[PDB]
Write an enzyme that holds these catalytic residues in place. Structure first.
Site, PDB file in Angstrom:
ATOM      1  N   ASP A 183      12.322   4.748  48.614  1.00 28.81           N
ATOM      2  CA  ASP A 183      12.169   3.663  49.565  1.00 28.81           C
ATOM      3  C   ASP A 183      12.397   2.247  49.043  1.00 28.81           C
ATOM      4  O   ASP A 183      11.510   1.655  48.418  1.00 28.81           O
ATOM      5  CB  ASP A 183      10.775   3.789  50.160  1.00 28.81           C
ATOM      6  CG  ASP A 183      10.535   2.815  51.281  1.00 28.81           C
ATOM      7  OD1 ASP A 183      11.515   2.262  51.813  1.00 28.81           O
ATOM      8  OD2 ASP A 183       9.371   2.604  51.651  1.00 28.81           O
ATOM      9  N   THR A 184      13.565   1.681  49.333  1.00 24.12           N
ATOM     10  CA  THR A 184      13.862   0.325  48.847  1.00 24.12           C
ATOM     11  C   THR A 184      13.006  -0.763  49.473  1.00 24.12           C
ATOM     12  O   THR A 184      12.923  -1.868  48.956  1.00 24.12           O
ATOM     13  CB  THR A 184      15.342  -0.053  49.047  1.00 24.12           C
ATOM     14  OG1 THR A 184      15.685   0.074  50.431  1.00 24.12           O
ATOM     15  CG2 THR A 184      16.241   0.872  48.215  1.00 24.12           C
ATOM     16  N   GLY A 185      12.365  -0.445  50.585  1.00 28.08           N
ATOM     17  CA  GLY A 185      11.526  -1.411  51.240  1.00 28.08           C
ATOM     18  C   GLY A 185      10.063  -1.362  50.810  1.00 28.08           C
ATOM     19  O   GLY A 185       9.225  -2.031  51.427  1.00 28.08           O
TER      20      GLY A 185
HETATM   21  C1  LIG Z   1       9.851   0.894  59.760  1.00 29.45           C
HETATM   22  C2  LIG Z   1       9.498   2.300  60.250  1.00 29.45           C
HETATM   23  C3  LIG Z   1      10.630   2.874  61.081  1.00 29.45           C
HETATM   24  C4  LIG Z   1       8.193   2.289  61.048  1.00 29.45           C
HETATM   25  O1  LIG Z   1       9.347   3.224  59.062  1.00 29.45           O
HETATM   26  C5  LIG Z   1       8.425   3.057  58.025  1.00 29.45           C
HETATM   27  O2  LIG Z   1       7.383   2.421  58.077  1.00 29.45           O
HETATM   28  N1  LIG Z   1       8.894   3.733  56.919  1.00 29.45           N
HETATM   29  C6  LIG Z   1       8.053   4.091  55.767  1.00 29.45           C
HETATM   30  C7  LIG Z   1       8.269   5.560  55.373  1.00 29.45           C
HETATM   31  C8  LIG Z   1       7.851   6.551  56.424  1.00 29.45           C
HETATM   32  C9  LIG Z   1       8.553   6.662  57.617  1.00 29.45           C
HETATM   33  C10 LIG Z   1       8.167   7.579  58.587  1.00 29.45           C
HETATM   34  C11 LIG Z   1       7.067   8.397  58.365  1.00 29.45           C
HETATM   35  C12 LIG Z   1       6.359   8.296  57.178  1.00 29.45           C
HETATM   36  C13 LIG Z   1       6.751   7.376  56.216  1.00 29.45           C
HETATM   37  C14 LIG Z   1       8.350   3.207  54.519  1.00 29.45           C
HETATM   38  O3  LIG Z   1       9.749   3.073  54.344  1.00 29.45           O
HETATM   39  C15 LIG Z   1       7.720   1.805  54.656  1.00 29.45           C
HETATM   40  N2  LIG Z   1       8.658   0.775  54.203  1.00 29.45           N
HETATM   41  C16 LIG Z   1       8.125  -0.593  54.170  1.00 29.45           C
HETATM   42  C17 LIG Z   1       8.293  -1.259  55.541  1.00 29.45           C
HETATM   43  C18 LIG Z   1       7.651  -2.614  55.640  1.00 29.45           C
HETATM   44  C19 LIG Z   1       7.772  -3.539  54.605  1.00 29.45           C
HETATM   45  C20 LIG Z   1       7.148  -4.782  54.683  1.00 29.45           C
HETATM   46  C21 LIG Z   1       6.396  -5.103  55.807  1.00 29.45           C
HETATM   47  C22 LIG Z   1       6.274  -4.185  56.845  1.00 29.45           C
HETATM   48  C23 LIG Z   1       6.899  -2.954  56.757  1.00 29.45           C
HETATM   49  C24 LIG Z   1       6.659  -0.711  53.725  1.00 29.45           C
HETATM   50  O4  LIG Z   1       5.744  -0.527  54.520  1.00 29.45           O
HETATM   51  N3  LIG Z   1       6.449  -1.047  52.455  1.00 29.45           N
HETATM   52  C25 LIG Z   1       5.107  -1.194  51.897  1.00 29.45           C
HETATM   53  C26 LIG Z   1       4.737   0.081  51.127  1.00 29.45           C
HETATM   54  C27 LIG Z   1       3.397   0.073  50.434  1.00 29.45           C
HETATM   55  C28 LIG Z   1       3.427  -0.700  49.136  1.00 29.45           C
HETATM   56  O5  LIG Z   1       4.504  -0.731  48.504  1.00 29.45           O
HETATM   57  O6  LIG Z   1       2.381  -1.260  48.739  1.00 29.45           O
HETATM   58  C29 LIG Z   1       5.047  -2.422  50.990  1.00 29.45           C
HETATM   59  O7  LIG Z   1       6.007  -2.730  50.280  1.00 29.45           O
HETATM   60  N4  LIG Z   1       3.924  -3.130  51.024  1.00 29.45           N
HETATM   61  C30 LIG Z   1       3.774  -4.313  50.197  1.00 29.45           C
HETATM   62  C31 LIG Z   1       4.026  -5.560  51.045  1.00 29.45           C
HETATM   63  C32 LIG Z   1       3.212  -5.618  52.311  1.00 29.45           C
HETATM   64  C33 LIG Z   1       1.902  -6.073  52.295  1.00 29.45           C
HETATM   65  C34 LIG Z   1       1.161  -6.153  53.471  1.00 29.45           C
HETATM   66  C35 LIG Z   1       1.731  -5.772  54.682  1.00 29.45           C
HETATM   67  C36 LIG Z   1       3.034  -5.313  54.707  1.00 29.45           C
HETATM   68  C37 LIG Z   1       3.768  -5.238  53.528  1.00 29.45           C
HETATM   69  C38 LIG Z   1       2.424  -4.405  49.492  1.00 29.45           C
HETATM   70  N5  LIG Z   1       2.432  -4.919  48.265  1.00 29.45           N
HETATM   71  O8  LIG Z   1       1.396  -4.021  50.044  1.00 29.45           O
END
Ligand SMILES: CC(C)(C)OC(=O)N[C@@H](Cc1ccccc1)[C@@H](O)CN[C@@H](Cc1ccccc1)C(=O)N[C@@H](CCC(=O)O)C(=O)N[C@@H](Cc1ccccc1)C(N)=O
Lengths: 99, 99
Positions: free
Chosen positions: A25-27
């Site tokens: 997951d690049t995101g």
């Molecule tokens: C967008 C959608 C169609 C709803 O699909 C997913 O959410 N896909 C997730 C996988 C999945 C899909 C379907 C079923 C099950 C699982 C995954 O790719 C999520 N990717 C990103 C999407 C995203 C990024 C940024 C904002 C909102 C949304 C993510 O949540 N990444 C998190 C993963 C957890 C982590 O790495 O800690 C992240 O980087 N979080 C960061 C930044 C952050 C903080 C607070 C809120 C949001 C984001 C963090 N350090 O907590």
């Protein structure tokens, strides 16, 4: 190798003697795995995504074999719906996006 | 081009006459954008991620210019914290992962 995105980018990983499937997951800044028995010390943490935030445990210097490459990094363990391999490990295996 | 993962994979996109930044996310099946005025008809939908589920509106056949490529696909608009470009569009621009 080269992996297209027509289907989910799922790979096999080996961590803590166990075999699992995980999404590249690049995101995701971090790597988060479904609840599992991992050994060692840890600090609680809270992470967020689309939908809100979850509480996970953070283990540092964990050895994971993603496909054929071994890497040591932090792995968050908590209630995620699926195992995701985030950028902290993707950089370790030299992973890049291309188009 | 080739994009490494040392930093978040953010790109500039043009959609509905507006300029925005978005995250190239291989772990997202769908493309979801922060609340925006988009024109046309739509159906409500619910999507999920780490943290739970959110309600978004689905617009089909929306033109988006990601970097230099134009693509037409579905875009979900709702309360996501950040704009994410998911696989439904990443395949359209020929995006692949490599390591
Ligand atoms: C967008 C959608 C169609 C709803 O699909 C997913 O959410 N896909 C997730 C996988 C999945 C899909 C379907 C079923 C099950 C699982 C995954 O790719 C999520 N990717 C990103 C999407 C995203 C990024 C940024 C904002 C909102 C949304 C993510 O949540 N990444 C998190 C993963 C957890 C982590 O790495 O800690 C992240 O980087 N979080 C960061 C930044 C952050 C903080 C607070 C809120 C949001 C984001 C963090 N350090 O907590």
């Amino acid at each position: 190798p080269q992996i297209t995105l027509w289907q989910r980018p799922l790979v096999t990983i080996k961590i803590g003697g166990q075999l699992k499937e995980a999404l590249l997951d690049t995101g995701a800044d971090d790597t988060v795995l479904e609840e599992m028995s991992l050994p060692g010390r840890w600090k609680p943490k809270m992470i967020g995504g689309i939908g809100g935030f979850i509480k996970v445990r953070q283990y540092d210097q964990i050895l994971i074999e993603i496909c054929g490459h071994k890497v040591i990094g932090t792995v968050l363990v908590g209630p995620t719906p699926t195992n995701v391999i985030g950028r902290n490990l993707l950089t370790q295996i030299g992973c890049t996006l291309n188009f």
